[PDB]
Amino acid sequence: IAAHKGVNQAPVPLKMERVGPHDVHIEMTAQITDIEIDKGKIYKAWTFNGQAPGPLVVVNEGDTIHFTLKNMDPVVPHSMDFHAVHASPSKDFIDVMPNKSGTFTYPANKPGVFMYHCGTKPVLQHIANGMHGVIIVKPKNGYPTDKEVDREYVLIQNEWYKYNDMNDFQNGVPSYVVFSSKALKPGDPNTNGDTFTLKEKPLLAKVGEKIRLYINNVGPNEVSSFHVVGTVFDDVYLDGNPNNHLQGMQTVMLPASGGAVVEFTVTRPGTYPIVTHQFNHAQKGAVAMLKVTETGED
């Protein structure tokens, strides 16, 4: 796209504020930002807020979101679809033109770990170029295992293809498949989907802890066989809904856009890889590390 040549819009923080006991304002951008998805490989991504996947959004069950998208792309329209919400797609996930803003309001009445993404046709093109992310909706009565959990993180799996190549998006194998982590609390890492950062800077934990991961595989195209090496998931809540309870899973199957809450114990010090067990994808990037130390610090 000629109007994207040389464009690299610096990342802009997510803006979010609570405006009532059940109402929350969120402001995001759509912007074009260079991201290093593998060493030496820059992808001029289509993004929310200069991150791909985009920034994490966390709301409470029953919150209505009053969402604004500011479209900083000079030529391509963008839009936002949160899988958390009940909305009219043709009214509420509509396009925002370049250099304009649009505001939409919709409720999040279901707990869980939901994908969000751009909804502009062709949606494959907008998702594959980087316009995906996760919104977590926290359950009003929590999860039955909340009191067991010592530490938590968010992980997202996505693919990257040949740059803005619709033939490859529809017909080709992914060039890279990658994990990123998005921060829940100050001091947590906040990374983009790349083949290396969570290997070189593992997530941290302490010996004996029960870890909860909020996970989503945003695709665009693959499913995920999510596994933490050296442990078994004690409890799994499919899509993060507390009712969809499984126990003792070695691997969690996630559809494209599928989410889960998974919990597992790390019994011994060491580094624990986190993979999709579709090992062609692991080989193409989708391995993150969890470093477990006697103190929980590096």
Q: Which residues sit in the known binding site? A: 4, 22-23, 25, 36, 38, 61, 66, 78, 81, 83, 86, 117-118, 126, 131, 150, 152, 165, 209, 222, 227, 231-232, 234, 245, 253, 277, 281
239 in Cβ contact with 258 (< 8 Å): yes
**118 touching a copy of itself, by CB under 8 A:** no
Residues 86-125, mask of contacts with Cu ion (x by CB under 5 A): --------------------------------x-x-----
Q: How many whole angstroms separate alpha carbon 9 and alpha carbon 248?
A: 45
CB of 173 to a copy of itself, least distance (A): 5
The nearer residue to a copy of itself, 4 or 277, going by C-beta atoms, is: 277
CB of 248 to a copy of itself, least distance (A): 4
∠ CA(120), CA(122), CA(124), 5° rounding? 100
The nearer residue to a copy of itself, 7 or 223, going by C-beta atoms, is: 223
**136 touching a copy of itself, by CB under 8 A:** no
Q: How many whole angstroms separate alpha carbon 15 and alpha carbon 249?
A: 37
Which residues 53-92 are close enough to bind Cu ion by CB under 5 A? 66, 78
Exposure of 145 in the CB half-sphere (CA atoms within 13 A): 25
Q: How many whole angstroms separate alpha carbon 134 and alpha carbon 27?
A: 15
The nearer residue to Cu ion, 184 or 229, going by C-beta atoms, is: 229
**158 touching a copy of itself, by CB under 8 A:** no
∠ CA(218), CA(66), CA(187), 5° rounding? 55
**267 touching a copy of itself, by CB under 8 A:** yes
Q: How many whole angstroms separate alpha carbon 273 and alpha carbon 267?
A: 14
Among 12, 26, 35, 115, which residue interacts with a copy of itself (rule: CB under 8 A)? 115
Which residues 197-256 are close enough to bind a copy of itself by CB under 8 A? 219-227, 229-232, 238-239, 241, 243-244, 246-256
| Known binding-site residue numbers for Cu cation | 78, 83, 117-118, 126, 131, 277
Residue 55 contact partner, candidates Cu ion, a copy of itself, none, CB within 5 to 8 A by sort of partner: none
CB of 277 to a copy of itself, least distance (A): 4
Three-class SS of residue 142? coil
Q: How many whole angstroms separate alpha carbon 153 and alpha carbon 214?
A: 6
CA torsion through residues 208, 214, 220, 222, sign: positive
Q: How many whole angstroms separate alpha carbon 99 and alpha carbon 69?
A: 10
Q: How many whole angstroms separate alpha carbon 244 and alpha carbon 239?
A: 8
